[PDB]
Each structure stands twice: as structure tokens, then as C-alpha cells.
Amino acid sequence: FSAFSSSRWEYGSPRLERYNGLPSMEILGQAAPGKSTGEAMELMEQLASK
Amino acid sequence: ATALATVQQLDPIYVDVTQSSNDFLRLKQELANGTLKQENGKAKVSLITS
Amino acid sequence: VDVITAIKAQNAQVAAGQLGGTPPVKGQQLNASIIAQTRLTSTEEFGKIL
């Protein structure tokens, strides 16, 4: 098998995700012990706006 | 053309060994580059059976 | 018939495997995916079928 084959290295993603038919990725995490979830959601939306 | 019988000598034995050409050339180049070392003369050959 | 056979033979997906795959031997410390002949993606690639 070494008389007609070569070899090299590459970089590849071992896990591909899709959401609603488009490539996507997911971040999962909680909020602070002393604040509401909705405020964290709004701040995450503002951060994603950037 | 058809032989009558066969007479064989067994006290010494020949072993014909297959080397891939690319590995042979690569090792020759490595030895010519000073990375490898040679000792005395003919190299030692060991055997592993089935 | 020959053209169809050549296309079906050289434009097919092959499942290669994994370096350090399951079940590994005791002492392995390198695991990676293996990439091999994949589906052709361009006309220039597709026109080099032998």
C-alpha cells in the first residue's frame, strides 16, 4: 500500500451542527445566583448584536 | 521442458525479501545525509516465522 | 458502459476509519480521523477520471 499512496495532515471539525437547515453552534450556560434570567437573556441579545 | 525430478540443497538457505522502492530510496538518502550510521559490512538479518 | 463503470468506481465515497480506533491496544495515545477518496466536486476534478 506504500508504493502508490501518500499521506498528510489536515484540520477538521469532529462535530457539525445544524439548526433549521443552516450551520449553527450552541452556547449553553446559566445566570448569576443573584439576578433574573430575563436580564441575562437581554444582555446576551445585546452582546450578540455586536 | 518437463523435469524428471528435483534435487535441493538445504544446509544454507536464501531468503528473498521485498522492499518498497520509496522506502529504500528514502533510507538511502537519509544514510547519505549523515543521519544514519553503518557498521563493518553486510547488515544483520533476523527472522520471524509464521 | 465503461464510462458509467469508471464514474461509479472513481466518484464514490469510502469510509476510511480512525487512527487509534476502537478497540485500541494498551498504550495508544493518538486518535484521529482518516480521509480518503471523497466525492468529486468540480468539473476539472470530474474530467480527470481515467
Swiss-Prot record, chain B:
Observed phenotype of the null mutant: Cannot grow on efflux substrates novobiocin or fusidic acid.
Tree of life domain: Bacteria
Localization, UniProt: Cell inner membrane
Description of how the protein assembles with itself and partners: Monomeric in solution. Homotrimeric; interacts independently with AcrB and TolC as well as AcrZ. Part of the AcrA-AcrB-TolC efflux pump. Complex assembly is independent of an efflux substrate and appears to be constitutive.
Family (UniProt): Belongs to the membrane fusion protein (MFP) (TC 8.A.1) family.
Function: AcrA-AcrB-AcrZ-TolC is a drug efflux protein complex with broad substrate specificity that uses the proton motive force to export substrates. This subunit may act as an adapter protein that links AcrB and TolC stably together. It is elongated in shape, being long enough to span the periplasm.
Name of the protein in its database record: Multidrug efflux pump subunit AcrA
Residues of the full protein shown: 200 to 249 of 397
Swiss-Prot record, chain C:
Top-level taxon of the source organism: Bacteria
Induction: Positively regulated by MarA, Rob and SoxS transcriptional regulators (at protein level).
Disruption phenotype: Loss of susceptibility to contact-dependent growth inhibition (CDI); inhibiting cells still contact the target.
Record-annotated disulphide pairs: none
UniProt feature coiled coil, ranges: none
Compartments reported by the entry: Cell inner membrane
The protein's assembly and partners: Homotrimer, with large domains that extend into the periplasm, interacts with AcrA and TolC. AcrA may be required to stably link this protein and TolC. Interacts with AcrZ. Part of the AcrA-AcrB-AcrZ-TolC efflux pump.
Primary role: AcrA-AcrB-AcrZ-TolC is a drug efflux protein complex with broad substrate specificity that uses the proton motive force to export substrates. (Microbial infection) Involved in contact-dependent growth inhibition (CDI), acts downstream of BamA, the receptor for CDI. Its role in CDI is independent of the AcrA-AcrB-TolC efflux pump complex.
Family the entry assigns: Belongs to the resistance-nodulation-cell division (RND) (TC 2.A.6) family.
Protein name: Multidrug efflux pump subunit AcrB
Originating species: Escherichia coli (strain K12)
Gene: acrB
